[model samples]
Target: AQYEDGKQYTTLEKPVAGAPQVLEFFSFFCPHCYQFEEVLHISDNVKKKLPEGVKMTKYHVNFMGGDLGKDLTQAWAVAMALGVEDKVTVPLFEGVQKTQTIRSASDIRDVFINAGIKGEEYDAAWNSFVVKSLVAQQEKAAADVQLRGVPAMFVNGKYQLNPQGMDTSNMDVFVQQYADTVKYLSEK
Candidate 1:
């Protein structure tokens, strides 16, 4: 759940996997996620260079209220189940960072479409059982974590160090350090 080479995405929760089982927590409305996008690319590269069983699962964090929060909430539920997280996450990043349409369904739809996912199917899948549980979990995760904002990453089960929360300047440095820390921890 940590980052490397200057995080291009969010932090990684700690206690990283021995061979796989990596999880990433993110939010569509978060700017720090945008900052971490750098290391995420490297993370992708690192993953590709690894063997099988190294799953890097991304959990898009969602709330129950706010603009399009319901939709995001539903989406997170599906993702926690059989969700196409990359499809949803990539577009969400684009929607909030590129398109700048954070609160519109259309923008979210665009994110789904461009990420190679069907908008209708995504909507349907989001209405599943786990999805409902996932929605509730968001509330619990938020309360338990006591996060200041979105884009928090936990490696395996431990929360990663938040550079953005620590300082608003030179986030790249922090992200890279975090990634290295994760890699180091994983190797040890």
Candidate 2:
């Protein structure tokens, strides 16, 4: 379901009762974030292999660096809260990656409008404190999260998900490693 503009997320789905999963935090403008998308996250074999108490939560981090990643954290948060991540995120990724036309928040707003969202809604969603906080707190979060780069990964927020460290180049394999880490954690 959709939410008022500027909320923390568009998702409304509660965590699956059977298991708690690590959250995958990302932003739309980061090229690495887009490149990572073509990789595998779920599959028949994966579904069968994941242990009894494992799942994954993908959270969109707005607050695009410039206009692109800036100040949309609140929009993303609210979208996730309303359960519209699936509805909104992939299109957003595609819009930026394929067209490479998204240079600012207005660009993003236009893209969303084309996706059937009202302009005012996008504005409201962007103006919220969530976006403000996301932008404002980025440096702090970066420090606390110890993020070295885009497409960074973590398990239980304790271990590094980077299989090759900064040397990592294969986005597909990196994604697979994250999935693999989840399963690895489950068995141990």
Candidate 3:
């Protein structure tokens, strides 16, 4: 649904370079994040026509604490490292939210291997210092935004959109309703 300015999001302190940076701050363990996957699938056409210069990325929030959050965060970092994020994104969410299959890093590693993220590339990224560094960067960024929950969107890191209350019942108009809101804020 079209967002109500000021009520849904706020301008940020600084703009994240690379105009139209679309980021989804999420947690694998969050059921709301899982539902967002459905919203994404429903909005596939809208994503295809996403505004130019949109650099989309998913940042995992370590919200649950302990092993669950850390393992999934690291797993996502590895996926990004191998550029296989799209491959494992939904399945990772399903693995946790639906199947409840992910328990430890070993389970997460197996999920990657099953998704065909193997060979030296997998080995190197699993715990690479670089991958770890990127994970730290995203975590710090999440904290910087005072992020309070999962499934939130950011445009150019200068504005935040929380889709918690948006209408999603009508697939035909769902994307159309929100697309302009995002585009408007991104260009603003």
Candidate 4:
């Protein structure tokens, strides 16, 4: 599929460096984001296809889960701070979207504990300056984009993906198209 500017993606007024930096704005409470990861494995597939030096970063949106949304975002920051994102993302998503078990910060902590992170370690990261700064940055980036919804993808902080332009007939095609589109936009 051919992606056209203003059709497949819109250019941002303030583009950042790192031409291929991929930023994904998502929420644990979003069922589509959950399916994108668990059912379709979009992130993993696209990641494998990404060129060297190109990487994806996720920002948990803070508008979906109410006050709990902020907490969940903090939870994600803690995971990043402790280098446990790979270990905790799916479980946290499951706790919210699949198992329907994550209700508060305590439940979020439990997910970390279940992922082999000690309670003390989790608490320390949760309150550490690095984690706080990460959370603040995520929130600021989310606001900068004026995000209307979750599961939004931006490349190089400039091109915002227009999902309606992509083909989604099947998992494989979707993943391929998505990765290609990201690569294309990155180079633009």
**Local accuracy by lDDT, each model:** 0.55, 0.53, 0.72, 0.84
List, residue by residue over 26-45, the lDDT tens digit for candidate 2: 77767767756544433323
User: How far is each candidate from the true structure, as Cα RMSD in Å?
Assistant: 6.2, 11.0, 2.9, 1.9
lDDT of 3 by residue, 46-145 (tens): 3565777666667888876467898888878888878888788878887787888888777777778888877567778876999989889778778777
Candidate with the larger TM-score of 3 and 4: 4
Best by TM-score: 4
Estimate, for each residue in 82-164, the C-alpha lDDT of model 4 and write its tens digit. Answer: 88888998999989888889998999999999999999999989999999999998988887777878788898778897766
Question: How many steric clashes between backbone atoms does each model show?
Answer: 20, 32, 0, 0
Quick one: best lDDT, which candidate?
Answer: 4
* Winner by lDDT between candidate 4 and candidate 1: 4
Error of 4 at 37 (Å): 0.9
lDDT of 2: 0.53
Q: Model 1, range 137-174, lDDT digits (tens) per residue?
A: 66555545555565555444544534443333564555
Q: What's the TM for model 3?
A: 0.84
